[PDB]
């Protein structure tokens, strides 16, 4: 699909069998999701945002569906303003910028 | 053009007679640039995200040249870690997300 940017590029995603709203964010290297229960062990990770660096939990090979496209990859969990679908997954669903 | 997301989507921009590297960011509502001098009047504003909030100066009707496309809009100036081209200007150059 083609998504314009007159409004926030928010889509519905599915993780752990639950539907959630998330932002397609080309400015984010990673995918950051609000606090939730994910399977497996996690590793520590520092990500730097507009206001500085924070600590998040990194879960690898997590199954996640984006606007109908299934992806399997790294998902970070921590204090985020909104669910962020970053480049690591956008690339997986073949998302590109065009103008 | 079509830009992949394997790596940060950085482009060169010309703003206020200065050349700068900036990030095409679909997750950003606003355009935020590192400290620089800009014409016209301005007002304070607080913006926040992953690292929390930072205070910036809002300048309106600022012209920015991005990859050959001229765009006019509000530009925020402050202590941002990376120069950000947000949706307010991405729309003006006809930039869309595609997959
Ligand atoms: C989440 C993340 C990573 O895992 C890794 C690197 C950067 C970010 C990140 O937060 N990117 C940010 C901005 C940024 C990029 C590179 C360096 C520093 C900061 C972003 O893509 C965005 O527009 N976001 C993320 S959170 C948000 C939805 C509020 C919005 C935002 O900050 N918007 C304003 C700039 C308008 C505040």
Of A54, A21, A61, nearest to A38 by C-alpha is A61
Centre a 10 Å sphere on the Cβ of residue A54 and count the other Cβ atoms it contains. 18
CA–CA dist A58, B33 (Å, integer): 30
For residue B39, the Cα-to-chain-centroid distance in whole angstroms is 16
* CATH number for the domain harbouring residue A31: 2.40.70.10
For chain B, what is the HEC assignment?
CEECCCCCCEEEEEECCEEEEEEECCCCCCCEECCCCCCCCEEEEEEEECCEEEEEEEEEEEEEEECCEEEEEEEEECCCCCCEECHHHHHHHCCEEEC
Q: Which residues pair with A70 in a beta bridge?
A: A65
Resolution (Å units): 2.0
For chain A, what is the HEC assignment?
CEECCCCCCEEEEEECCEEEEEEECCCCCCCEECCCCCCCCCEEEEEEECCEEEEEEEEEEEEEEECCEEEEEEEEECCCCCCEECHHHHCCCCCEEEC
Q: A46: domain range?
A: 1-99
Q: What is the number of domains present in chain A?
A: 1
CA of residue B41 to ligand 1 center, whole Å: 27
Specify the residue with its C-alpha closest to ligand 1, atom 8.
A28
CA–CA dist A94, A18 (Å, integer): 23
CA–CA dist A7, A51 (Å, integer): 23
For residue B29, the Cα-to-chain-centroid distance in whole angstroms is 9
Within 13 A of A34's CA, how many CA atoms are on the CB side? 10
A90 to chain B, any CB pair closer than 8 A? The answer is: yes
């Amino acid at each position: 699909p083609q998504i314009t940017l007159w409004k926030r590029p928010l889509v519905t995603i599915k993780i752990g069998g639950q539907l959630k709203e998330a932002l397609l964010d080309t400015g984010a290297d990673d995918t950051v999701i609000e606090e939730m229960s994910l399977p497996g062990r996690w590793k520590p990770k520092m990500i730097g945002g507009i206001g500085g660096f924070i600590k998040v939990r990194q879960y690898d090979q997590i199954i996640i569906e984006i606007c109908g496209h299934k992806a399997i990859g790294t998902v970070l969990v921590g204090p985020t303003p909104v669910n962020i679908i970053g480049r690591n997954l956008l690339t997986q669903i073949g998302c590109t910028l065009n103008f």
